[PDB]
Amino acid sequence: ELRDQQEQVKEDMETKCFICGIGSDYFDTTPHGFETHTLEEHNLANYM
Amino acid sequence: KDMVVMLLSLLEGNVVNGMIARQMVDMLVESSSNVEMILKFFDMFLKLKDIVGSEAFQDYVTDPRGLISKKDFQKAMDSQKQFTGPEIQFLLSCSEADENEMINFEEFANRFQEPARDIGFNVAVLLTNLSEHVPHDPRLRNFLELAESILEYFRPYLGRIEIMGASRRIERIYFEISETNRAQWEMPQVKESKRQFIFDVVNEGGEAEKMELFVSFCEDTIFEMQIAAQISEPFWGELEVQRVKFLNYLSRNFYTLRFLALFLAFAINFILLFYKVSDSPPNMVYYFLEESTGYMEPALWCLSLLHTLVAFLCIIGYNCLKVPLVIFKREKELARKLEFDGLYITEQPGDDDVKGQWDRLVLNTPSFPSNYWDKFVKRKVLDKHGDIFGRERIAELLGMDLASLEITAHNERKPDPPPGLLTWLMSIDVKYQIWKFGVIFTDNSFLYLGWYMVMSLLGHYNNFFFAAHLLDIAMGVKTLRTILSSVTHNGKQLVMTVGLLAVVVYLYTVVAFNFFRKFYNKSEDEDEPDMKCDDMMTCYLFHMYVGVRAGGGIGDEIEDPAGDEYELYRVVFDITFFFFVIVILLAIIQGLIIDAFGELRDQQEQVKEDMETKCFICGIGSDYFDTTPHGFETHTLEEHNLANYMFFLMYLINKDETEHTGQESYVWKMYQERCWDFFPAGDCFRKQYEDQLS
Amino acid sequence: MVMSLLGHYNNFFFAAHLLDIAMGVKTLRTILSSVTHNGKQLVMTVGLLAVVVYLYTVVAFNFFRKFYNKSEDEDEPDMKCDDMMTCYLFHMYVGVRAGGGIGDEIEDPAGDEYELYRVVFDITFFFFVIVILLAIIQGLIIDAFG
Amino acid sequence: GQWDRLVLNTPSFPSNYWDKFVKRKVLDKHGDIFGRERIAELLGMDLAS
Ligand SMILES: Nc1ncnc2c1ncn2[C@@H]1O[C@H](COP(=O)(O)OP(=O)(O)OP(=O)(O)O)[C@@H](O)[C@H]1O
Ligand SMILES: Nc1ncnc2c1ncn2[C@@H]1O[C@H](COP(=O)(O)OP(=O)(O)OP(=O)(O)O)[C@@H](O)[C@H]1O
Ligand SMILES: O=c1nc2[nH][nH]cc-2c(=O)[nH]1
Ligand SMILES: [Ca+2]
Ligand SMILES: [Zn+2]
Ligand SMILES: [Zn+2]
């Protein structure tokens, strides 16, 4: 149970944007789209 | 061929139903008769080359010289029902029949096979391109049908990929795959490397490094193909040719030698099962075999010598077969970090990276890129960083002579290469060799083979050291390797829980020493007792040795507490020991092992489902492609085949840059700049022309 | 057929037909498929167990031969580890089946020059053989169920 | 595949399978290129019948 909790959290972070909830599949139409979205567009550190 | 190449250049950057492609189709229709004549010329000789090899044709062949009469050829060819009468007459005319009307079909069939190959391939490429970009012109299906044999012939060599092109659109690229490249890609070792790479990336990789990793894998695979080609098989000169023949032999048969070593170890150990120890000769004892045959003692010595020799040969084969790839990968990563990052020019790793600190020995060596293909990495690093950090400083860092660059650009020198061992002596780059040997000695496979060596040699000092080689089955057998990985998967957890068990047993030992010391008399004697808990160390040994191994805990071993002032305290002590130590902690260990089993299985399943559900290149799921029947299968076999990207990289490397097309030059430039934006990401040809195709 | 016919030669060959319940009952068939699912793994891990027990047998023969006297008699001893084959049989027969490993069967090492060596021998045998490998087998069965 | 070689030339190879003309189809498909008489011997057919 503990292992699958950790895996679930990791996959959620690597698959959806923490802010807007849009999945990585939409952003990935553009190359590295999700990476740029989570580093520049909707970075939670930036909201902080 | 040149004219068809010009036409293909006209089709560059051509959309579906583009007007240049439609004009090309109208041209081909306007010259339909001549195009059909060309296609009939190609298919006739393609069919001839395969007919001459038929047993039906060989039945007609009767002359012992290997010739056939014209009349026999005439009656044989029409029996196949593949040519018309005029075509058979034309083939007879083209046959160089002698005055005796005798035909050498062996050379007749092969006469035009080689001259017509390149033009045949380009005609096939042209027809494929036009068919895929003008999918709704019925005038072109006729040409495709007339070229059906040509297209079927060149199907294994017609490589196609898709890229995100210069025009911000997905473009389809057609190129050529060679027989040698395809055959090398089909080798079992290469297929295993591909499976391992796919597993690594899909399992423990992100979506960002995927294409860089794939291209690095392609480069490594190209190098492995070169090594395989080199080791493949079809007084100083004599000894050198024999030495390289021997080294290639060891390299080719490395795995058979490995299996032979394992088999020899099993045989040795089976002999060793017959050992016996006796005081009488065959106050110290004698060890000797106990068998009736009388041949086991000689057989053991012979097998020990043979096994040591086989181990040595395995070492040599490994350093001739895998070590080149090890050094290649290391040189390649070091060079790219020097150039694109300035590892030792700007950042200077901080002594905690043993790899980076060890790589400092190779920078100034004359021969730093020995296995890596790039012999101009130092020039590139200098041209990139010398202005800002000092050209002379960079030259000293990389061991370059600033004066020699100009003369090397000026002209080429042809010195005397004297084939003498004395002259070869000083030519050894000792610093490079020390670095290379350090890299090799820090390699797991080489270390394992060296340990195999050492234990095999110690087996001669004492034959029971050959028992250690029985452990080789774990690495020899993928099944054992998976099973033992199911233990090593949670090794840190296992060590930590054993430590926790030691701590809890120590706490129980403290309690027992302070209070329950009476019960630890393990002597049935009445006048000399053996108290196991009159000392911390003795009591702790006793607990960790007997209490953990007992089924019911320490209470099984120590004395009965019934009828004592401390009965309840001691029973709580015993029950809690049994529960925390015997039940819970051993359950934790077994659970870690079982969980590792499940984790490995679900990793394999995840990789398999990912491969069977998404395209490895573009990331589009199988559900989109499956709208068309077998859409995902065709997409992964024709449109976005990763083997085709590997083959395309090989093709670009081999081809001349002056001969590169526009698309090829584009991909080549972005390859050299390490920019992977040409890989179609989230988009494909079918998606881009959904409207026109549908 | 063959076992039914042999049952007339000896009626106890009819006991073999009691095994038919595995194929007769889908429940038994599923349960036994839960064992056969990882049969290659089970055979391989039993082989690995044989190898590790053999390594322990080699160590015991070379060093701990004194402790393998399984005779309460004082003048005629029964030494179980004066031979490779006898010692290996002894280990694979009693050490694997013992709850605490081979140390449960062989003599006490207290008050010997090799006490610490022998206790390490015993604890490692118990952990690698009794705990880890049997846990692997049971885990293969449970994983096949899942 | 090696055991199936015993049944090819049998008079009654498709006994349970519904297709009693499989040999005729195989001959009509491959006999021109590989030899009609050779195929007939392989499948145990009589070309005259
Ligand atoms: N809004 C968001 N802001 C930041 N990260 C986000 C957001 N939504 C999703 N993520 C994901 O959170 C993940 C966590 O990023 P982070 O750099 O903290 O992890 P990491 O890989 O463990 O870090 P590092 O390797 O730099 O130590 C990112 O990889 C990203 O995919
Ligand atoms: N771009 C891609 N190129 C190739 N295969 C891809 C790609 N994307 C996904 N795949 C999937 O990778 C799978 C692996 O194919 P492969 O032929 O190597 O496997 P296999 O079935 O084990 O092989 P074989 O049975 O021929 O030995 C394919 O079935 C395919 O669905
Ligand atoms: O640009 C390259 N040049 C090469 N030569 N040999 C292998 C090469 C490669 O991957 N890339
Ligand atoms: Ca040019
Ligand atoms: Zn967002
Ligand atoms: Zn794709």
Curated annotation (Swiss-Prot), chain A:
Detected in skeletal muscle (at protein level). Fast- or slow-twitch skeletal muscle. ATP binds at M13, E14, T15, K16, C17, F18, T38, L39, E40, E41, H42, N43, L44. It is found in: Sarcoplasmic reticulum membrane. The N-terminus is blocked. Homotetramer. Can also form heterotetramers with RYR2. Identified in a complex composed of RYR1, PDE4D, PKA, FKBP1A and protein phosphatase 1 (PP1). Repeated very high-level exercise decreases interaction with PDE4D and protein phosphatase 1 (PP1). Interacts with CALM; CALM with bound calcium inhibits the RYR1 channel activity. Interacts with S100A1. Interacts with FKBP1A; this stabilizes the closed conformation of the channel. Interacts with CACNA1S; interaction with CACNA1S is important for activation of the RYR1 channel. Interacts with CACNB1. The calcium release channel activity resides in the C-terminal region while the remaining part of the protein constitutes the 'foot' structure spanning the junctional gap between the sarcoplasmic reticulum (SR) and the T-tubule. Pore opening is mediated via the cytoplasmic calcium-binding domains that mediate a small rotation of the channel-forming transmembrane regions that then leads to channel opening. Cytosolic calcium-activated calcium channel that mediates the release of Ca(2+) from the sarcoplasmic reticulum into the cytosol and thereby plays a key role in triggering muscle contraction following depolarization of T-tubules. Repeated very high-level exercise increases the open probability of the channel and leads to Ca(2+) leaking into the cytoplasm. Can also mediate the release of Ca(2+) from intracellular stores in neurons, and may thereby promote prolonged Ca(2+) signaling in the brain. Required for normal embryonic development of muscle fibers and skeletal muscle. Binding of [3H]ryanodine indicates that the heterozygous channel is activated by Ca(2+) concentrations 4-fold lower than normal. Single-cell analysis of cotransfected cells shows a significantly increased resting cytoplasmic Ca(2+) level and a significantly reduced luminal Ca(2+) level. Belongs to the ryanodine receptor (TC 1.A.3.1) family. RYR1 subfamily. This is Ryanodine receptor 1. It comes from Oryctolagus cuniculus (Rabbit).
UniProtKB/Swiss-Prot annotation, chain C:
Residues 26-40 are cytoplasmic. The N-terminus is blocked. Residues 85-104 dip into the membrane without crossing it. The modification Phosphotyrosine is found at Y68. The chain crosses the membrane at residues 9-25, 41-61, 125-145. It is found in: Sarcoplasmic reticulum membrane. A motif (Selectivity filter) lies at residues 99-105. The modification Phosphoserine is found at S71. Detected in skeletal muscle (at protein level). Fast- or slow-twitch skeletal muscle. It comes from the Eukaryota. Residues 8, 62-84, 105-124 are lumenal. Binding of [3H]ryanodine indicates that the heterozygous channel is activated by Ca(2+) concentrations 4-fold lower than normal. Single-cell analysis of cotransfected cells shows a significantly increased resting cytoplasmic Ca(2+) level and a significantly reduced luminal Ca(2+) level. Cytosolic calcium-activated calcium channel that mediates the release of Ca(2+) from the sarcoplasmic reticulum into the cytosol and thereby plays a key role in triggering muscle contraction following depolarization of T-tubules. Repeated very high-level exercise increases the open probability of the channel and leads to Ca(2+) leaking into the cytoplasm. Can also mediate the release of Ca(2+) from intracellular stores in neurons, and may thereby promote prolonged Ca(2+) signaling in the brain. Required for normal embryonic development of muscle fibers and skeletal muscle. Homotetramer. Can also form heterotetramers with RYR2. Identified in a complex composed of RYR1, PDE4D, PKA, FKBP1A and protein phosphatase 1 (PP1). Repeated very high-level exercise decreases interaction with PDE4D and protein phosphatase 1 (PP1). Interacts with CALM; CALM with bound calcium inhibits the RYR1 channel activity. Interacts with S100A1. Interacts with FKBP1A; this stabilizes the closed conformation of the channel. Interacts with CACNA1S; interaction with CACNA1S is important for activation of the RYR1 channel. Interacts with CACNB1. The calcium release channel activity resides in the C-terminal region while the remaining part of the protein constitutes the 'foot' structure spanning the junctional gap between the sarcoplasmic reticulum (SR) and the T-tubule. Pore opening is mediated via the cytoplasmic calcium-binding domains that mediate a small rotation of the channel-forming transmembrane regions that then leads to channel opening. Belongs to the ryanodine receptor (TC 1.A.3.1) family. RYR1 subfamily. This is Ryanodine receptor 1. It comes from Oryctolagus cuniculus.
